[PDB]
Amino acid sequence: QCSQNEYFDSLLHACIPCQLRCSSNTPPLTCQRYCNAS
Amino acid sequence: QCSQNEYFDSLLHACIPCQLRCSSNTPPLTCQRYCNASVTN
Amino acid sequence: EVQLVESGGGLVQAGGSLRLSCAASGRTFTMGWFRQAPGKEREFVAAISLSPTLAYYAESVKGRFTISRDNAKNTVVLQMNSLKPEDTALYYCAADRKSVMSIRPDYWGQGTQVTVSSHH
Amino acid sequence: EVQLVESGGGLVQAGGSLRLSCAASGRTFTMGWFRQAPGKEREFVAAISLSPTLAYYAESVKGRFTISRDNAKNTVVLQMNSLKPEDTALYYCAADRKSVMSIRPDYWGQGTQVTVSSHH
């Protein structure tokens, strides 16, 4: 459903840009790649 | 430079959703993938 | 405590357009909109980040609703096009001091009614 | 033909916000904004389509500018945040009877000046 560097939020039912999670303590696994480069 | 279903326009320097090109005479090559296998609902 | 004041609600026909806005007394990182329909649980609509300004939408409104915020004015705006009758609901603007909007945000608006009616 | 009238331009500071809007006397499939800086070619900024409402931005304004459109009012809005001094330009709104914005559109605006001052 989401693009290359997005993740799907089960509770929002929305695709979120992973860059909103690089600052966070634990980004989603699917994002770690983009967030801080592979 | 863009997403899976996006193509890059050098004259606009912008990423464009390929959905806007399915109805083209010639959708961009990276878009035929998505547009030939879409759905109208 | 941030105060959220909404405006722009009302009645529309299917296929029409309607703009909602919400003014906040202070600036949070995330601003957006939820909605609640009669006999349903409140559902996320849209949200947008402070910096960078990245917008994200529920799957059921993507391609029909856009969201934009004025960070100076501390406002958020939800522009709705291609309205369906099922878009009828109370629309609550929400502010959240989080990276991504949460389903329990820190602040809520009062809720503004939007009624989409069929033709005939 | 179709006439485009622009609104909202003026003076802003680095890091500030500014909302430009453009009213069209008619409805085209593509609405959007270009800008021209002194001694530079006119460059594409942003655009949005009628149905579905899909927004696309130049690489240099993505993440800072957003765009919306009211299809009923035939208006198109460019919301600018995180303004930089190099965002100073004449901002033209444009309409196009094409699926994607062209660099030679059908309809142009008079252009409104947007000046991003710096601090200190």
Residue numbers in the entry:
A (entry chain C): 7 to 44
B (entry chain D): 7 to 47
C (entry chain A), D (entry chain B): 1 to 120
Pull text from the paper:
We generated a panel of nanobodies against BCMA, and selected a couple with the highest affinities from the initial screen (Nb1 and Nb2) to arrange in tandem in the extracellular domain of the CAR used in cilta-cel.
In parallel, we solved the crystal structure of the Nb2–BCMAECD complex at the resolution of 2.7 Å. Although the asymmetric unit again contained two copies of the complex, each BCMAECD contacts one Nb2 exclusively in this structure. Consistent with the structural analysis, the SEC results showed monomeric Nb2 in solution and indicated, most likely, a 1:1 stoichiometry. BCMA interactions with the individual nanobodies and the nanobody tandem (NbT) were further characterized using surface plasmon resonance (SPR). Both Nb1 and Nb2 displayed similar, nanomolar affinities (3.9 nM for Nb1 and 4.2 nM for Nb2) to the monomeric, His-tagged BCMA extracellular domain (BCMAECD-His) yet markedly different kinetics—Nb1 showed much slower association and dissociation than Nb2. The superposition of our nanobody complexes based on BCMA shows considerable steric clashes. The nanobody epitopes on BCMA also overlap significantly.
